[PDB]
Amino acid sequence: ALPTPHEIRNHLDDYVIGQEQAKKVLAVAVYNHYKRLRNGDTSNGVELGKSNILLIGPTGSGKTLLAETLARLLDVPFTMADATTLTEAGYVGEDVENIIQKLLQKSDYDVQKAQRGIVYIDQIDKISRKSDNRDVSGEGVQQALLKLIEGTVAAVPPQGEFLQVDTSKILFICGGAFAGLDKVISHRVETGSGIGFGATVKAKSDKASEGELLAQVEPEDLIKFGLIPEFIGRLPVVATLNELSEEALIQILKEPKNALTKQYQALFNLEGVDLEFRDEALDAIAKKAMARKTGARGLRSIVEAALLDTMYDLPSMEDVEKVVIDESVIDGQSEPLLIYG
Amino acid sequence: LPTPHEIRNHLDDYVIGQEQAKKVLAVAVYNHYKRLRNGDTSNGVELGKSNILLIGPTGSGKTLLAETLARLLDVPFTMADATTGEDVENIIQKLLQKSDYDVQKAQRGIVYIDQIDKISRDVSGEGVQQALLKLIEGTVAAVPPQGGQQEFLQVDTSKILFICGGAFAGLDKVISHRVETGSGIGFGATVSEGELLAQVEPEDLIKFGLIPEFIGRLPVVATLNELSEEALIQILKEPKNALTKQYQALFNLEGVDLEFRDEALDAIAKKAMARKTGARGLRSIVEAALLDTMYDLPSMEDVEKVVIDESVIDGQSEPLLIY
Ligand SMILES: Nc1ncnc2c1ncn2[C@@H]1O[C@H](COP(=O)(O)OP(=O)(O)OP(O)(O)=S)[C@@H](O)[C@H]1O
Ligand SMILES: Nc1ncnc2c1ncn2[C@@H]1O[C@H](COP(=O)(O)OP(=O)(O)O)[C@@H](O)[C@H]1O
Q1: Is B267 helix (H, G, I), strand (E, B) or coil?
Q2: Is residue B151 packed enough to be buried (19+ CB in 10 Å), middle (13-18) or exposed (0-12)?
Q3: Does A185 touch chain B (CB under 8 A)?
Q4: How far, CA to CA in Å, does A317 sit from each of A267, A272, A276, A323?
Q5: Helix (H) or strand (E) run with residue A311 in it
Q6: Which residues contact B38 (CB under 8 A, 6 or more apart)?
Q7: Which of A192, B57, B158, B317 could form a disulfide with B311 if both were Cys (CB 3.0 to 4.6 A apart)?
Q8: Which of A17, A249, A263, A297 maximizes ligand 1 atoms within 8 Å of its Cβ, making it the mutation to test the pocket?
Q9: Long-range contact list for A283-289, CB < 8 A, 24+ apart?
């Protein structure tokens, strides 16, 4: 009884911010995974639906973060693979069995402990079907993962005969960033616009928001993207993430220990100078961040773009003990204040 | 070994509201396997195969009839898609995986296709119908056994039955003017669709976009017109693998009781029909509702029963709890 859905959401809140709905979904699926394996196929209900996860969100939304923060809190091992280096037919790039090999290294070759492990994959969009231009990075890779997800056994050389390791009990988290998916959903939901007086006048973009647009997604929508329907059928769960809120970004710069403010703060403390960031400058940065349409990953651009001149002349400058950054410095047409003595 | 009456009852256990479709597949599959038990040894040499064509809305149980039938009959079965230049070899090797790469056992298997109307009106559009013609008549395709020998196994395609599933859009207008009446625009002229589909003929399919050569190979026709609102409730109650029974069984091991009143199930029918997706878009309504309850249920203690009301589906109210 180690995992608690009410507690697992509290722990992720410490390392992740801005995604409340997605955290609830993972707690249910994760709890249902071990609840099932506690009594495997012994209940009266036969043909129980398999529990998997499908993370869908924009860039910098925290998809990769949930996979890492979850493994730290969790006891069973965790792996972080990628679909970009995967090939088929034993080519020079990589094989699907490598994911099972890396799992044992984390578990020290414990099959009983490895079957209860977690799996995570990034950049699932790369394996999306494409028209013929041979195409090895595509449908072929999906077939290997499909038979692997549906439950089977794969030969694994122990320590480098082969060992059989069932996979119907192992969890899989296929997650990545889908590009152009919003356009596909728009065609289905928009259904045109009226032109007369009584018609619903449309502005430039009243629905171009991942939130309220991805929640209405369906499995058939992903088929047009390139994925196989049978592959999606094995993942009934879906997790829709929204673009980070401007207020949420502020919290990322203050509460997390790895905040960019704390990073540059220590960067100048070793140099013998203090640093400060007022609240009026944080919200201003959030306005510029959303305009870039990159997420928290593209937040560092606004910071270094401002402190470029300051850092250039700080080592040469002497007798400077503290630096204060005003809101005008971020908007422009101003210079950060410097403290001497 | 089975009979049309015996197989009808088994199908009834997992499927409901489609009576005519059961008799079609029963006699078809019965006579289909009869040819395998006795081939050209009889006077009737070269017994031809009779393909099957399913027509119904989306989420109308088209896939379940093929999937459930496969479980009942101890033979392999795969699922194909009209989306996948020819790209027809993937369907053969996909079947050998379940059959453990067997020639004779696979040859008696069945295959299902979805969205067959998506190609009717280019190598991915009308070019697919032309290619299938030989596949639905008989041929052999190279399939690497085990992936690799430098050899390939031959697997005929005359013994493998095909079921082209899909949902035709706008077909009702074509048959109305041809058979029932030419109307819809005039004053006196008349402005469920199921009854019309029963009177369907291949001539109407030609105007839809299909090729006559393609339709000739599928003389059998099935009409999965619609699913009733009560049937949806029955779908969650009569089948042993219903989702309502799954969640009930999920909490049985937890030591908590579950309930689902009839006043709450009818609301699910409205949301299903509102999405125009059928039974496929059902878990989204249930899982989205019980997400809150499941999230805090383990944390909560001294709770032996849970009741879900109609308001709970909307989300305005909270599911009643029992201590
Ligand atoms: N919810 C979040 N809360 C706080 N910081 C976040 C959040 N999401 C992203 N970040 C920041 O962005 C960095 C990268 O997070 P990722 O999980 O990689 O974002 P991502 O959208 O998952 O990237 P991809 O495209 O999935 S690889 C983290 O190290 C944080 O600094
Ligand atoms: N008559 C029915 N009885 C029981 N379940 C049904 C029925 N019709 C549809 N379903 C449900 O729908 C799902 C399959 O939908 P499917 O046939 O794949 O939709 P589509 O035909 O649009 O692909 C199954 O999980 C099944 O339980």
Answers
A1: helix
A2: exposed
A3: no
A4: 16, 11, 18, 12
A5: helix A308-313
A6: none
A7: B317
A8: A297
A9: A283/A246, A283/A247, A283/A250, A284/A327, A284/A330, A284/A331, A285/A249, A285/A253, A285/A330, A286/A246, A286/A247, A286/A249, A286/A250, A287/A246, A288/A330, A289/A246, A289/A249
Cβ atoms of A55 and A241 closer than 8 Å? yes
Residue B228 alpha carbon to ligand 2 centre in Å: 13
**Inter-chain CB proximity B250 and A147 less than 8 Å:** no
CA neighbor of B322 nearest in space, from B259, B275, B274 = B259
**Which tokens go with A231?**
């592959």
What's the CA dihedral at B203, B208, B211, B212 to 10 degrees? 0
Rg of chain A over Cα atoms, rounded to whole angstroms, equals 24
Q: Which position has the token pair 């058979």?
A: B179
For chain B, helix, strand, coil in percent to 5 are 50, 10, 40
Facing residues of B113 across strands? B164
Rg over alpha carbons for chain B, rounded to the nearest Å, is: 23
| Length of chain B counted residue by residue | 323
Contacts of B46 (CB under 8 A, 6+ apart): B40
Beta strands in A98-207 (DSSP E): 118-122, 153-156, 163-166, 173-176
Please state, in angstroms and as integers, the Cα–Cα distance from residue A77 to each residue in A14, A30, A110, B44, B163, following that order. Answer: 21, 14, 11, 63, 44
In contact, A285 and A249? CB cutoff 8 Å: yes
Q: What is the dihedral of CA B107, B110, B112, B117, to 10 degrees?
A: 80
Ligand nearest to the CA of B167: 2
B255: helix, strand or coil: coil
Report the candidate in B86, B38, B111, B109 with the shortest Cα–Cα distance to residue B101.
B109
Token pair listed for A154? 């794969």
Per the CB < 8 A criterion, the answer to whether A203 and A118 are in contact is no
In the reported structure, the alpha carbon of residue B281 is separated from the centroid of ligand 2 by a whole-number distance in angstroms of 10
Beta carbon pairs, A and B, within 8 Å: 71
Please, are residues B70 and B91 in contact by the beta-carbon 8 Å criterion?
no
- In chain A, which residues have their Cβ closer than 8 Å to the Cβ of B287? 236-237
B283 touches chain A (CB under 8 A): yes
- In chain A, the residue whose alpha carbon lies closest to the alpha carbon of B91 is A143
Listed by the residue before each break, gaps in chain B with C–N over 2.5 Å are 84, 121, 148, 191
Asked if B253 lies within 8 A of A48 by C-beta distance, the reply is no
**First CA to last CA distance, chain A:** 59
Q: Which domains does chain B have, with CATH numbers?
A: 1-225 (3.40.50.300), 226-323 (1.10.8.60)
CB contact under 8 A, B249 and A89: no
Considering only the beta carbons, identify the residue of A5, A44, A236 that sits closest to B299.
A5
Q: Which of A118, A227, A144 is nearest to A178 (CA)?
A: A227
